[PDB]
Amino acid sequence: GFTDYKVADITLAAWGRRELIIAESEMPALMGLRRKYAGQQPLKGAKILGCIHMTIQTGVLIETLVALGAEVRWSSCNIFSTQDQAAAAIAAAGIPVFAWKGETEEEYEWCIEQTILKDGQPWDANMVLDDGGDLTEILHKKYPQMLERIHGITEETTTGVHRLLDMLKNGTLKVPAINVNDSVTKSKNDNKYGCRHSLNDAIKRGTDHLLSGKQALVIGYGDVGKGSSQSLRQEGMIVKVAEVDPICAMQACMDGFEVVSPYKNGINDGTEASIDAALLGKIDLIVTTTGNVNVCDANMLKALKKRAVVCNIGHFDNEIDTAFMRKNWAWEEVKPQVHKIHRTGKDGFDAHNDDYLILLAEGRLVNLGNATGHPSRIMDGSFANQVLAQIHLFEQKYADLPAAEKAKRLSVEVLPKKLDEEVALEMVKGFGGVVTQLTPKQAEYIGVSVEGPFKPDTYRY
Amino acid sequence: GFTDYKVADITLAAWGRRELIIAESEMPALMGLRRKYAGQQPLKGAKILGCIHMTIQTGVLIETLVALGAEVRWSSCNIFSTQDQAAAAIAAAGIPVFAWKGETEEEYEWCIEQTILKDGQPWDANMVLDDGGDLTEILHKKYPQMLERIHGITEETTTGVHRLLDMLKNGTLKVPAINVNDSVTKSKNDNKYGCRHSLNDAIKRGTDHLLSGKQALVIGYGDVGKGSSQSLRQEGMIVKVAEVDPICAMQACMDGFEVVSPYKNGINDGTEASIDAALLGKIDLIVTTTGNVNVCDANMLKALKKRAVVCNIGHFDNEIDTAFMRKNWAWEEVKPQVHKIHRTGKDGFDAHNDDYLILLAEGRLVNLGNATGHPSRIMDGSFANQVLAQIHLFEQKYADLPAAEKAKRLSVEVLPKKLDEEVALEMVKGFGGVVTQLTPKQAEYIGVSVEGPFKPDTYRY
Amino acid sequence: GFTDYKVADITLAAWGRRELIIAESEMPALMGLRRKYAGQQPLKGAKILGCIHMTIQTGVLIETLVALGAEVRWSSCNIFSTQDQAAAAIAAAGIPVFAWKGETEEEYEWCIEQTILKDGQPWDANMVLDDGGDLTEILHKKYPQMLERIHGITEETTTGVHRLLDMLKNGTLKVPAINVNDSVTKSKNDNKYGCRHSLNDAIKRGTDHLLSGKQALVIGYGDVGKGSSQSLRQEGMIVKVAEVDPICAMQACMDGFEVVSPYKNGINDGTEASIDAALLGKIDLIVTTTGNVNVCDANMLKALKKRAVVCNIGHFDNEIDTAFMRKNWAWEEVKPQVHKIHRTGKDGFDAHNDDYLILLAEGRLVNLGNATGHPSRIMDGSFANQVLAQIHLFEQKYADLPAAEKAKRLSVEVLPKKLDEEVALEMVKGFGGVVTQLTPKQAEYIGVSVEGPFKPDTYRY
């Protein structure tokens, strides 16, 4: 008689369980943590509010936390990223989850509130796992009393970590956090290689367009932009890259990309005349990867080649001025998460009009919106870090300190390199790779221990 | 009141129609044939039996043949390759089509017969379009009288051309045929680049497996094997290649792949002792590409690494010994066209057994079975050749020739290089490419006309 | 007391012998023929005039022909392509060779004549091995009497075959020929992969320029152009391709290249107004691969980006209008085969002028001019074909047949596919590859012999 959930179709649970069993074989770091810590139950007593894409991969994470003793209440951190069969499997296992593919904004907020509230009253939560900072923001803004009992936050992604550091500098952060994003086995695995796998995957599922021989513009060349550019280049696209960071621009050049700006001489003054109309007129596909605001703006959208695809793989949809397109242009749904946007007018469209753009996932995270996000074996690294971070913060029991002691432990930290390496070793073994062991004299020669850590904390990999 | 069809769901037509309109903008050579020939109606009076994958791309082909004056009756050439919304769009257009995704073998044969028979009698067909030779075989073997009225066959694929050539060698081919496969804008575009696009696409949709860093074995290195190996290598797989043709094997070496055999010394004597158990026990993914029989045999299946993915992108499912797997091992459906094959035995399976293989599309063509096959811009090339082939054979009027002229005309031929080049030029313009025109002195220097053809018929590209 | 040679420096012979011994281990097809046929001496009595780049690789070719019983007299087919240590090692072995790096045009002609003449009068030659057709032309124009005793010509390269075909068509070809170029183990090995290896090699040796991130324009996308484009793209260049053949252009598009023309809309009208000055002013490197005339013309050279590198990897230097650059612009030698060409005028130059181009090998074959051409393991394929072609034509004894039989054998033909496959098998084995053997049933299924040939003669690979 379990009813504390809300999913699209509970009967998809058996299908979801089949895929969870497969995914478990693809996630050895996470399943190794489950085996190593199951008997010790290091999360016994933890009550975790979780807000992250309700995919099959997140399901393995959820059941790993539960296997270690935790109770959880879960929601997705995006309206399009849930895999309904994963949510169904988690609900059928008796775990409160509120998540389905294609939520409205109102339903998105309701789902988070259903994790926060149990039977109309605040749940006695004491841990937070977030991806992007929406749950974190709601707790600080609307439920500050609940944070008095919460031992910490473990934050998944770059945008969320940015919001956390903003609150820390403004003195508004109420509990300590661990930056899961900046582990090497997260940032340089998930953010880069994950988008390499899943960006062309989403574009093919949404459009079935040939990419070889076509022109792409990738806005940004951080980790997500690096992986995105590779996702397209390996398919044979001619890829151009835009950046505001000269060091990232240098890497793009050395990686074999032409570096261009959508604006003449890189200067974005807000006018149509600043747009490089000749450049945008040749682009078949534009992808935003920045985590910034309005990096594919209304003047760029007006100037893009007819029938160009437009998508975003950064965390929030405001990378693209989709508001401008809702106000001025007529939307034709091809299928879910795929819209033709007719630049001929707002009121109606000719079904055979040739002047349209194709928008994927209404400008929300395209890899999760139009495909299934990152594959299990990549998320294995990110989610082993999440499990380790949850254990660390829960065992430190920040909320039980006196007021004076909380002030001294309020911080945003990363996991130590030794744990990063141990996650990486399990990932390598999952590939069948064999790591060499240093001899004692070789370890002394480079000044490390035989068991690591093998690099100083300044090393960039 | 049109009722002459059978599809999964006629209400998918509007969705199919939206995707057809997108596909037309992706297929400029085919769409260019509509404009150049619409006024002349070169297929007026043609009644075409067509048997080929009922995809969106085949939709554009079908409606091109109809726009040039033809009547058609269509079926798919594979039980899993139909896109149900394409079939719905075609039927809703008043065009007879008998095709749905996931047919049984009996329904497959039934669908082809519904194209052959109209109102219980043979249709007065006079043209054939085939992909694989199944329709051609059924006509020769079961409706030879209909071939008295048929002017020719245009065959799409390598396996179908081989069957035509065997019939010709045996004196058992009743109408002339055009080998559409061996146009360069078909074989060196569809067969190679199409599989490059669509193989990893299908594997991702089926399993969502990370491919980077894993081991693949591609059986075959002809056109499909070349494109398949690239599909996987560009994703970061470590790809090994098997071949019986030493020329193709040389190409794989020079392309940067290790060439291996599943058998010790390359000698396939049919025994378990001949299997290189070490090699097979390291392979995460095996893909057959040969058009041959039993190239992923039972002994290889027994020796594959636990949880390896097995699929076939050749035309017929007998490239993998799936019959052996049906007889001996338990099949667990993950989802449509994805099965776990449990090697623990045939009488049931443990849901948490680790000793299984993952078979895609039940060994049927994986790109069409687990995804959508080749993209529109690639199929543009194949299907422009098909339309040109249909025009040439229909206007030749073989069925109306005297018996002496019939005997001189009974052959299997390819399209002339000029037509191949003309298709290629429209493909290049679709990419925005600009071809240079020879000066008269340059044309004289290399001994070609400024208008081409630019290569001798022996040229291999 | 052997003096019948002329080389740069005989004392380089020991060095040349060391490298020949290494190259022998890299040339298993060639050495396999040596071991297989040395007992039979099938070239006993053959007297071969040979004209092909006097490299280490040609050294192994020459000594294989001698090992099989032939006498030869040798010259290079390019003024810059000889490796002086290879020539010295051949002369030290008592083999007539006339070749050194850096010949004048007069010396080049004199060297070919020294092979034709022994003691001031025509040698009793009876076979010809040629690369590019210069020796073949001199025999037909200046020594036609010698051709009445010559049993055949074995021609290495595409341009040479073109000239042979023109002569056959005109009725001026006096002896049969084997087209060695169009063996798959030659054209699709040497012409493509050889240039992939040696083009970026020669550019680095000549300029030491970083190639990553810069813009290249490759004129042509045949076998040489395909390999040259890959040579640059794999280094990270942004590569654009020009073509007159829409089929080759299609391949360049599908291979991930942007296809452009130096002329607006591809129309070369002889005026500067037709030059796409905006495109050419972005190009850092241009490479001609066509075998055509003036594909990098004067107006192009004027519009190139300052400090661009210009080079040719086709057979003859007229692909670039270097005559224009000699007449109008000041040449500054950087080092042998590397010249700065100052576009500021003809009479001298400022040492610090910024407006110059860099010309490699004075527009002669750049891979052989500025580096060492193709590696031994690739030339293995080409030269194994040469040996088999020499054996076949010599044993046919064309010159001694009745003219009624001569008329039936006066042709330009390629080797049989079976021998093409045997050469490929030995190359694959050189890599450690293992070719799989068809079972009798599999061979039956696809219609071949277990021993091959495995493809019809129309197969393009």
Ligand SMILES: NC(=O)c1ccc[n+]([C@@H]2O[C@H](COP(=O)([O-])OP(=O)(O)OC[C@H]3O[C@@H](n4cnc5c(N)ncnc54)[C@H](O)[C@@H]3O)[C@@H](O)[C@H]2O)c1
């Ligand atoms: N979709 C996914 O699966 C996924 C995975 C990881 C992260 N993310 C999200 O993607 C975003 C980027 O993450 P990241 O790790 O790459 O961050 P990052 O800081 O490494 O990279 C962002 C880059 O954008 C550049 N940039 C900023 N403004 C720009 C502008 N106007 N024009 C061009 N370039 C500009 C920055 O210089 C920077 O290099 C974040 O929102 C993150 O949360 C998404």
Ligand SMILES: NC(=O)c1ccc[n+]([C@@H]2O[C@H](COP(=O)([O-])OP(=O)(O)OC[C@H]3O[C@@H](n4cnc5c(N)ncnc54)[C@H](O)[C@@H]3O)[C@@H](O)[C@H]2O)c1
């Ligand atoms: N799925 C698709 O979209 C698609 C597209 C085109 C063709 N096809 C089909 O794919 C198959 C192959 O087509 P193709 O054009 O590449 O033919 P191909 O002749 O060009 O190449 C097939 C290759 O398989 C090799 N081979 C044969 N038996 C072998 C064995 N026992 N082990 C290893 N290698 C072996 C042959 O040497 C040959 O090089 C045919 O059935 C064709 O109809 C499928």
Ligand SMILES: NC(=O)c1ccc[n+]([C@@H]2O[C@H](COP(=O)([O-])OP(=O)(O)OC[C@H]3O[C@@H](n4cnc5c(N)ncnc54)[C@H](O)[C@@H]3O)[C@@H](O)[C@H]2O)c1
């Ligand atoms: N340097 C080497 O090691 C090496 C090796 C092999 C061959 N070659 C020589 O290289 C040349 C090319 O050989 P190939 O086998 O590639 O011949 P090919 O016929 O395969 O390719 C030449 C290509 O140039 C294209 N072309 C012709 N005129 C053009 C123009 N004005 N603009 C653009 N493209 C144009 C043609 O369409 C053709 O595709 C020949 O001279 C050959 O003898 C050199």
Ligand SMILES: CN(Cc1cnn(C)c1)C(=O)C1CCCCC1
């Ligand atoms: C047949 N024609 C006219 C033509 C072009 N060249 N020549 C000598 C005649 C076309 O344009 C087709 C070519 C293939 C598909 C699109 C349009």
Ligand SMILES: CN(Cc1cnn(C)c1)C(=O)C1CCCCC1
């Ligand atoms: C090993 N092979 C090839 C073959 C035949 N069948 N299979 C499955 C493989 C043979 O033909 C031998 C068999 C015994 C002695 C003579 C020749």
Ligand SMILES: Nc1ncnc2[nH]cnc12
């Ligand atoms: N598959 C996935 N599950 C959860 N979060 C993700 N972020 C990116 N891919 C993801």
Ligand SMILES: Nc1ncnc2[nH]cnc12
């Ligand atoms: N999309 C497609 N439609 C028809 N035939 C195909 N063969 C391969 N892909 C195809």
Ligand SMILES: Nc1ncnc2[nH]cnc12
């Ligand atoms: N190394 C080499 N030797 C002889 N001829 C060649 N042609 C291209 N490379 C060569």
Ligand SMILES: [K+]
């Ligand atoms: K996934």
Ligand SMILES: [K+]
């Ligand atoms: K498709």
Ligand SMILES: [K+]
């Ligand atoms: K060399």
